[PDB]
Symmetry: D2
Subunit: 445 residues, 4 copies
């Protein structure tokens, strides 16, 4: 096959850029999709009964016609994140309503409104053909993908593309995701693949890594500096693990909170010492449904002061929202910043404002990451200061159980999946760098 | 009485520094105070029936001993602030708690832990005597005073004195307040008296104006900018009256929220066009005790777009708190700031975090201002760009009446208090500069 | 003649979008042109004997093809910026330098290097057709176009598009600039055309006014706040005419620097009072080619303190470069900001670093404005807050004389140029708003 | 002797705060002092020839009266700075000249108006007596000192105490410095002693460490973040050594410039990989006394890139000044920061402003450090993330010889001076944390 010929080119390790420019398009590429008719076959099932292995079809799909500022990507590996499972489960709504309302933009965007939806918001691969006006990416380049597609027509997002109102998540709100052998992205979603990682490790950190980078490291978020103390609220989790790594490498002290010594172990494995087991310590910040227990804030406060010897956290890395958020405002040191990018336990937060104004704290909402923030996060991955958190890797044919595993926190870390890659372990090109931190790269395994 | 010999020296106009330095110190002075035999007199009862007239006393108290870095000041006039209302009704907790808890600590701070507490967080007057090490001021100096008391012994407040862990509010978290004939003040709260205002006018702005300056104008606050749209709650009130002015003088367009049509015309007198009488529109942002009404939020946003031309506010000047805060978060422009220095209607804020993280908004805590911001605020008053909003003056014997006027929303500007000044109209040493801005000066009548 | 149809359809007052969409395009258009033939045929003599009239050509150049994300705009009027001065003057190097070898990249960047260069970096006109991918802008939309041009596939520009390494400047560092009949722009350069202004008025602020806004008003620049003092060099000129408006409207104090009592009195007209004439005081900041005299800085510092009653300027709006920059750093208040967007008198700046590091000042380089800043500056104009500063108006044929008058300082604010607009005075569709500020709108003529 | 009991108290351990309070103060203490009658012995002679061994007296001296907000310190160890070297030298001005009229200030200040000047601006010792009002420190606390004295009577330094006009460096512009066995300092000069260092090591970080901290790390300085690239000039020197450690502890990449292989290796022992021998590469940034050689700027930029792999530096840690500044401004990344602190080779800076405004770079001036920056800089030392750069220790008797060594660059790191301490190596109360950093602590061996 032609599909075969390209894989051999990637695997050769000697295919020049022009070699790639010479490989022919296959008319089809297998894909993990959803079919527009199977929407309601799932309405009325709980936290687990709606199931992803049923609505996930492995289709042979026609190749999209590319246009300006876009790249066809041969996908070695991708992943299954939260939006992937949710779409596979048609939560919250049906992603075909995204594809159709996003089809009202232009004829090129109409390409996305199709009977099927190719899922996938991550990507590690080789670019094959680039569209009109592309200059920055030659065929043959090893890439990962930032999953924020911005159109950038309104002026809003020209001092921060995260402000741009037409922001879409590639593979979730547009089509041609990465859970597939071929893919189409905007070249301003492409990032240089780190040479010391596997294909599967390379596309693992993804949105969750850049999201924590902007929230913790960038000046749009809390502007971590060396010496800061930072409370991190789900440290072994996706967001928290990378947020832990950034604290350590930025020169700061993570304080990691967890709900099992299994989770506590992964933070030690990453470099953390100061770890709180919120379940071991019996924290009940809400005495009921409507009222909080301010002594439960104070109890965590003093527990924090144990690992630090008196100081409070300059920064709280928030995301559980409703349950944690009262305490996280309380515990923050005077003039400190609470930064939020999610509200998993409930989006209606309640806090004691006295603690905000009298102590001059600030809550700063954060969301995803712009391309420059996504770049610098991927950069820190590429330089060896931040590490992928892969745990299980699947094969393309079994993306269902890939997404039922994530559907029930079956793993502690990320779930990658080989696409064109025949087996795991390929991709490296800087084995030295890889051997310097092998110890931590596969910590979540 | 040595006190009348002090007042007569002010009223002369030619008493120089050597004359105040020679004048004899009284042994007692008249002061409004709370007693620690009355500290729970109001307990178990509706916050509203809690009458300030039943808790405030006219007393004679002995002169305090002056420590290093302090000015003893003969107070011509002071003002009623909302923090005096709260002292007067022992909410949210009595002020004798932190009088004791900063009292017998260092011996010097032990001078404040008295059975009585004189209030008054503004003053305008003449320096009587200075403690050791004072160089910037001398007896006879004409002075107004802000209410920040910082020890500045900690490292923490040396990049912004507000972060001093021991920053107090003078006359509220400390004794020897300015609702009184003499006040005991750190020299680093002193600022020169605006020579065109009267005694009671000049004592009007210092607390509230400074706060609104840090909150709105400062880079430590919302860092407003010309052309911003700014939602200003309680826009005729204390903070509102200077906040509106800062939005106006800054080239911003305010949307002034008021509770009354007559008070909707002081804003137009002030220069504002965008006025929302919240009692007229009848917002019920809270459905019950525990549930807000997001459609009342949206109705508020609709009325703002009415004025701005479909634009959401860059900045919301918050201070109503609980009742208002949900709405405040909703209508704020994407990337906008919710800057809060208070919680009048309740400090247990609740809000939809989804509008904050996903729209990249910020809730910035504010609290008074550092000496630099107070200097800058008063400097603006002195230049005739910002103007006092004095509406009524009471006498030191009727201070408890005034506190009631503002406890209930009875009066909505700034209500003054004569201390040693026996009439109004005393104080102007710059008649011509006062002749230019008289109409705005007398705008709050 | 096709060009007539367009101008006729524009000149009417009911031309629908489908009117402009059906209209036929001319095979060519009149345009002001530097010739790469005359590259070094004026190389050797001083650039003043290089009168701009000799190098600028009026050529009937053909239409380039309308590329994606681009718009073909019929241009009623442009303006002269002195980035056209040393376009014509060919200094420090010819514009064809960073034009010619930018083709081997993408073929669509190659259209820009011809043997000719259409200059001009302002525009008021009407869009003809839109490139691929463009939804926001429709034929018949009346638009101004600021001159920021960014490809934005590099990630560096995604926190602010002006950190794009491919940020060029249309008409100065690209082809097909505003001094023509039609213009080829990126649609992300298009802004609402203020509807109360004429074609020529609406075209004048674009460049200088965005630069000034970003340089002085945005946090990316000086960050003006109310009460600042602001030394504005060239307050009369194209940059200064907006800076002065920003100082006054943001509530700060401008100290205006001019070289003619005529330009003083128009500054006084705009509302300023603290005015200095660098002809009259006779400032020699340089004793010779290589040395300065702090006696003269001090004397400049002296005069400034006359106006402000003892206060040094927080902000210096710099741009004359080497002759003033040394004086500008000395004069600025401690903790203050010298912000700089060019170097008219020469780019090798010389300053005494003691005044910088010991006084905590900062020098901030500014360049143009990202789209958001361009939209905020144009929004203020449109809102009637900032006014255009048109001086003279020329027809396109006499652009060389326009550039010569500015290149000699024989001018005041902005020199306009008619392109398609047969006569001055056309374009106004809000005479109500127009007739409210006409005295300040025509202040400069 | 009274002094031996104090020493004995300290060397014992044991001595509780009570016993330190009970111990008897000496009538006098031994000290190094300048004599008011000697300001002119080194008149007309080369600075190299001027000899502190003749100027520096070893006098027994009465201790001053203990003022408010002041602490009496038994200094175990001190250091010698360039500020100290110039004092011994009577350069630039006579340091007695400053005492005589800062004495003329308050009667408190007047205590420094002596015919002798105890020099010494770094401190390692034990608090003996507190003055009035002190709450943070008690008799027996182990302290180092920040050498900045601020009055703070002015509001200018209440947003950052470096803006306080009446600011002095203790032991240079105040008397009772730390080259003595007792020293008198304000309480807000005091920092806790890193428990793992010896007395002379804990006195070596001092002003150069905190200056580097504020210039690089603080948001008053460059605000470095992890992943940043930083050109550090003189990276083996005082500023540069600490600047290098700050780049490495915060997860950035220092690019160290040095002028010999023997210093290049010191940088490697500190942790630096990228190092540039200035004099090996032979950079002649100045063709002569007036013109620069920009292709030497370019060659510096080329070598930096070879280290970063293509990336220009986000931050240049400047301080050499005229010789280096053109290159510093040239090679910094688009949108990055030159942070300058001093100008050793010359304060008359010259640079091409084209690269400043067009690439949106900023020159930020920084001076010393406020107390919060000094606390945080000291604290990172205590964390064991920053280490002191001591290379040689003298006894108090040899302070004159020590002063010549630094005056003749006889050493690379800092020259400690034992004061009360008998031998080297005393003072470590945390041997385990010392063990884990030992080779880095002694890396200036
Ligand atoms: N990644 C991104 O870019 C963005 C993600 N989001 C949100 O991310 C998802 C949230 O999961 P994500 O962080 O990405 O990865 P995870 O699936 O690993 O998140 C699980 C973590 O959340 C913590 N947690 C959950 N509930 C609580 C609680 N009641 N109290 C304390 N901690 C709690 C848990 O910590 P513990 O071990 O202590 O139980 C757990 O480790 C949302 O679906 C949404 O997408 C939002 C914006 C951006
Ligand atoms: N943190 C700090 O440093 C400082 C904080 N403050 C705070 O400001 C106080 C506000 O009062 P102040 O500015 O002194 O002068 P006022 O009391 O006169 O103004 C408060 C205004 O807020 C409006 N308001 C009251 N209740 C509500 C409500 N439930 N919803 C919406 N708006 C309401 C009212 O105006 P209307 O009814 O007409 O709309 C009232 O005028 C806060 O309580 C707090 O004390 C003040 C100074 C400093
Ligand atoms: N970085 C960028 O992207 C942009 C920069 N610019 C700026 O344009 C120039 C400002 O001029 P512009 O607004 O375009 O129109 P002008 O060139 O006409 O205005 C320049 C003003 O600078 C005044 N000036 C003051 N001192 C000197 C001096 N020592 N030597 C020469 N002129 C002096 C001039 O006369 P007078 O004394 O009467 O005031 C003149 O009015 C700046 O140099 C800069 O290029 C403009 C747009 C964009
Ligand atoms: N009156 C004066 O002379 C002035 C002195 N200064 C000083 O600046 C600060 C320097 O601090 P500090 O680090 O402790 O001094 P150090 O003695 O510890 O070393 C400073 C480093 O500066 C480097 N350096 C010296 N000259 C040059 C040059 N021409 N180009 C590049 N690098 C150079 C050298 O590094 P290497 O040789 O290895 O490359 C030298 O080691 C001082 O605090 C002081 O204020 C500042 C302004 C004026």
């Amino acid at each position: 096959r032609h599909m075969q010929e390209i894989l051999d080119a990637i695997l050769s390790g000697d295919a020049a850029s022009a070699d790639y420019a010479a490989l022919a398009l296959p008319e089809s590429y297998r894909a993990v999709t959803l079919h527009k008719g199977e929407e309601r076959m799932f309405d009325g099932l709980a936290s687990r009964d709606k199931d992803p292995r049923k609505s996930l079809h492995l289709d042979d799909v026609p190749l999209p016609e590319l246009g300006p500022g876009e790249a066809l990507v041969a996908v070695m590996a991708s992943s299954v994140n939260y939006n992937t499972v949710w779409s596979s489960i048609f939560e919250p709504v049906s992603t075909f309503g995204f594809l159709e309302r996003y089809g009202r933009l232009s004829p090129l965007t109409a390409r996305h409104d199709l009977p099927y939806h190719v899922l996938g918001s991550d990507l590690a691969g080789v670019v094959l053909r680039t569209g009109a006006g592309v200059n920055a990416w030659k065929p043959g380049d090893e890439v990962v993908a930032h999953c924020l597609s911005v159109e950038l027509e309104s002026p809003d997002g020209h001092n921060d593309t995260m402000m741009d109102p037409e922001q879409r998540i590639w593979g979730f709100e547009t089509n041609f995701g990465g859970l597939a052998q071929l893919a189409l992205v905007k070249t301003n979603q492409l990032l240089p693949k780190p040479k010391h990682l596997t294909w599967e490790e390379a596309a693992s950190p993804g949105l969750v890594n850049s999201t924590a980078y902007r929230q913790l490291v960038s000046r749009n978020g809390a502007g971590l500096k060396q010496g800061d103390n930072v409370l991190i609220w789900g440290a072994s989790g996706g967001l928290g693990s990378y947020a832990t790594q950034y604290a350590l490498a930025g020169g700061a002290t993570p304080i990691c909170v967890v709900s099992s010594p299994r989770k506590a172990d992964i933070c030690r494995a990453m470099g953390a010492e100061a770890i709180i087991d919120r379940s071991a310590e019996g924290y009940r910040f809400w005495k009921d449904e409507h009222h909080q227990d301010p002594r439960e804030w104070k109890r965590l406060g003093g527990k924090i002061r144990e690992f630090t010897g008196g100081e409070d956290v300059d920064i709280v890395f928030e995301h559980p929202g409703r349950e944690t958020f009262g305490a996280s405002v309380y515990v923050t040191r005077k003039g400190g910043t609470i930064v939020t990018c999610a509200s998993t336990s409930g989006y209606m937060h309640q806090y004691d404002n006295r603690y905000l104004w009298m102590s001059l704290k600030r809550i700063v909402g954060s969301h995803f990451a712009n391309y420059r923030e996504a770049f610098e996060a991927n950069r820190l991955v590429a330089k060896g200061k931040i590490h992928p958190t892969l745990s299980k890797v699947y094969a393309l044919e079994e993306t269902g159980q890939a997404a039922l595993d994530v559907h029930h926190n079956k793993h502690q870390g990320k779930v990658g999946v080989l696409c064109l890659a025949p087996r795991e372990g390929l991709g490296v090109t800087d084995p030295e760098l890889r051997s310097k931190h092998l110890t931590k790269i596969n910590a979540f395994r």
